[PDB]
């Protein structure tokens, strides 16, 4: 039995090699089982210095999410989360725009909707629309990673054209599909 959050499902995987780009990151998380996991009720991470992967620092980074840590990781150099589970949509179109150090990918539906596939100082990202066809909880998953130094990871989405734009959190995710009542 899987448990039932208003959240994503979040992993965390350290290293003491070079993360360069997102084939990087997703290669750590085939290596091995995760060095935490936690539920992702609130993706908004961040930013702080001197490397997500070393101290604290992922703690501070994860924040009001940080309290569902499964352990404390060990120091390493380079690090990343891999999120998965399920948001609420309705039938229409979105777009992300995204704050990140280092780089990132989201997927919905299995389609990536935003990318940044090499390693960065905080920038934002206007990225390109998609659309939804059924309303309903979609599958999505992220991957971000720190290759060192600064980092932050903030995924906004919005619903109106790039109007308005909100974060990701327990209003309307689910780990599992069905709906939370927590
Ligand atoms: O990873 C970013 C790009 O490289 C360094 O400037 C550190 C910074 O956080
Ligand atoms: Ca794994
Ligand atoms: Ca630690
Ligand atoms: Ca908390
Ligand atoms: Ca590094
Ligand atoms: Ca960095």
């Given at each position: 039995?899987?448990?039932?959050f208003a959240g994503?499902?979040?992993?965390?995987?350290?290293?003491?090699?070079?993360?360069?780009?997102?084939?990087?990151?997703?290669?750590?998380?085939?290596?091995?089982?995760?060095?935490?996991?936690?539920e992702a009720a609130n993706?908004?991470?961040?930013?702080?210095?001197?490397?997500?992967?070393?101290?604290?620092?992922?703690?501070?980074?994860?924040?009001?999410d940080?309290?569902?840590?499964?352990?404390?990781?060990?120091?390493?150099?380079?690090?990343?989360?891999?999120?998965?589970?399920?948001?609420?949509?309705?039938?229409?179109?979105?777009?992300?725009?995204?704050?990140?150090?280092?780089?990132?990918?989201?997927?919905?539906?299995?389609?990536?909707?935003?990318?940044?596939?090499?390693?960065?100082?905080?920038?934002?990202?206007?990225?390109?629309?998609?659309?939804?066809?059924?309303?309903?909880?979609?599958?999505?998953?992220?991957?971000?990673?720190?290759?060192?130094?600064?980092?932050?990871?903030?995924?906004?989405?919005?619903?109106?054209?790039?109007?308005?734009?909100?974060?990701?959190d327990s209003?309307?995710l689910?780990?599992?599909?069905?709906?939370?009542?927590?």
């Amino acid at each position: 039995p899987d448990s039932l959050f208003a959240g994503l499902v979040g992993e965390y995987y350290g290293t003491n090699s070079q993360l360069n780009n997102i084939s990087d990151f997703r290669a750590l998380v085939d290596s091995k089982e995760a060095d935490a996991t936690f539920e992702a009720a609130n993706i908004s991470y961040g930013r702080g210095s001197s490397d997500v992967a070393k101290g604290t620092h992922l703690q501070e980074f994860l924040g009001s999410d940080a309290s569902t840590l499964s352990t404390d990781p060990g120091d390493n150099t380079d690090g990343g989360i891999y999120l998965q589970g399920y948001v609420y949509l309705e039938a229409g179109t979105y777009n992300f725009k995204v704050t990140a150090d280092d780089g990132y990918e989201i997927t919905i539906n299995g389609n990536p909707v935003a990318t940044v596939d090499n390693n960065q100082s905080v920038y934002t990202v206007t990225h390109a629309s998609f659309t939804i066809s059924e309303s309903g909880y979609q599958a999505i998953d992220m991957i971000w990673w720190d290759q060192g130094g600064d980092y932050v990871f903030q995924p906004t989405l919005s619903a109106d054209g790039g109007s308005t734009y909100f974060v990701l959190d327990s209003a309307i995710l689910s780990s599992t599909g069905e709906t939370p009542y927590t």
